[PDB]
């Protein structure tokens, strides 16, 4: 696409969440959700082949249906209270329908089946955008109404998302699905702590973003979609194995990496509220994430899979990637646990 289209489309993608985040009125929050939905569509389907077209279609009908449900909440609330914002007096069922619709937009299970497939049909950089920047708008709405959310709905969604994300990711050889199920599981953690401490949902989002960004950038370095494709990194970009491994352990919540901090503080704050049972199952199923992250580490940095003859040409050539952002996000996403007290508050 020509530079005018990129400027218009990339500005609109950026504009959406900023409108949702800066808006007092609910209809303007909805408007920002529409900008993101509309402008991402051309980006997703740019390569125009049978798979990205299905991906851009499944995404549209999912996110448009969820939009209509959110709008119904915004309108039933204006009927009940004559105002364009949710109040303590807003009907209970109005809030729950907003929650289910937004979770449908985030990809939280059981409204999750679309996310792994859409992430699979699109290029890596748009998976990065979809799994990161596109989550801030629905989440910023939820953080604005956390005093009102029914915790029983939120915890069932979070428990479901942590389980389904673990089980789903355990069966995947496609990296883009492993990233989608990774996302689903982490959204479970952000959502579980939402009605209690919304600040910890922002900590878990930010740490997830700076872990998920370099991971995509790492796969975008050689355009590697499979476990066998990523297994050739020792013979292609061996300098990358040291930080891919840590980021994967960091995404797994293993100490003493930055990714342990979000799970650990969420568990700590959940049990300040006596949320013992939910917290225990959440931490016990987060163990399953580490297993299929460990399996990836086995295939890439801790063993050498067979390589092919044509990869010798690849070595004669010179790469201009990755950029200075990959190194900055790799270190901060793994070696920042000793700064934990400065991140929570």
């Amino acid at each position: 696409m020509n530079p005018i289209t990129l400027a218009i489309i990339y500005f609109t993608i950026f504009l959406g969440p900023v409108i949702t985040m800066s808006s007092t009125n609910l209809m303007l929050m909805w408007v920002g959700l529409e900008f993101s939905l509309l402008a991402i569509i051309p980006m997703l389907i740019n390569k125009k082949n049978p798979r990205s077209t299905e991906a851009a279609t499944k995404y549209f009908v999912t996110q448009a249906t969820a939009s209509m449900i959110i709008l119904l909440a915004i309108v039933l609330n204006y009927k009940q209270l004559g105002t364009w914002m949710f109040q303590q007096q807003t009907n209970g069922l109005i809030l729950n329908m907003t929650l289910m619709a937004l979770s449908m937009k985030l990809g939280l299970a059981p409204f999750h089946f679309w996310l792994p497939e859409v992430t699979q049909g699109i290029p890596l950089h748009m998976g990065l955008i979809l799994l990161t920047w596109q989550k801030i708008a629905p989440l910023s709405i939820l953080i604005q109404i956390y005093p009102l959310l029914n915790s029983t709905i939120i915890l069932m969604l979070a428990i479901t998302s942590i389980f389904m994300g673990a089980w789903g990711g355990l069966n995947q050889t496609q990296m883009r699905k492993i990233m989608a199920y990774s996302s689903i599981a982490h959204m479970g953690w952000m959502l579980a702590i939402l009605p209690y401490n919304p600040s910890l949902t922002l900590l878990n989002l930010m740490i997830y973003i700076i872990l998920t960004a370099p991971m995509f950038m790492a796969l975008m370095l050689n355009n590697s979609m499979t476990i066998n494709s990523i297994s050739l990194l020792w013979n292609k970009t061996p300098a990358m194995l040291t930080m891919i491994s840590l980021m994967l352990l960091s995404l797994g919540g293993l100490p003493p990496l930055t990714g342990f901090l979000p799970k650990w503080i969420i568990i700590t704050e959940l049990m300040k509220n006596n949320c013992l049972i939910m917290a225990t199952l959440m931490a016990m199923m987060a163990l399953l994430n580490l297993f299929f992250y460990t399996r990836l580490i086995y295939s890439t940095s801790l063993t050498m899979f067979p390589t092919n003859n044509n990869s010798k040409m690849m070595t004669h050539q010179t790469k201009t990637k990755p950029n200075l952002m990959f190194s900055t996000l790799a270190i901060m996403s793994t070696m920042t646990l000793p700064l934990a007290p400065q991140l929570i508050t």
Binding site: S151, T152, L155, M156, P195, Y196, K272, N273, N274, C275, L276, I277, M278
Partner: protein, 142 residues
Amino acid sequence: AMVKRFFESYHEVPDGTQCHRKTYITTALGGICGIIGSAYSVSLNPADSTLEAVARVGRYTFTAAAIGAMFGLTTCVSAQVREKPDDPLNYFIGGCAGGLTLGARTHSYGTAAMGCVYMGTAAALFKIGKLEGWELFPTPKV
């Protein structure tokens, strides 16, 4: 709402007494899980017919009902033969009978073992939860 009242009839009277009332409740409770399971089952992994669809709903709901009826009986029977109401070991015996029933209906000795242990422990922790007042979904305090 009534349907909530019915499921709270299960804890008005000390365990081991009003045995059939409890067995009825956990039998309905198991059926509700079986119906919810079938709904997802038929919708996500659809069958080749429509009778074959309904058969799977019946097979899941009776199996789920059977587990609930064997749990709610074995728990109440054990809880009065031993004359030990406030006791998690009762719910471990009932939960395992539930697990045994699951394996019996599934033609799988392995499921019976896993079901006897996993469900017995889950049932015991439910009892220990009510004694100590653990809440599944607490409300925000801090």
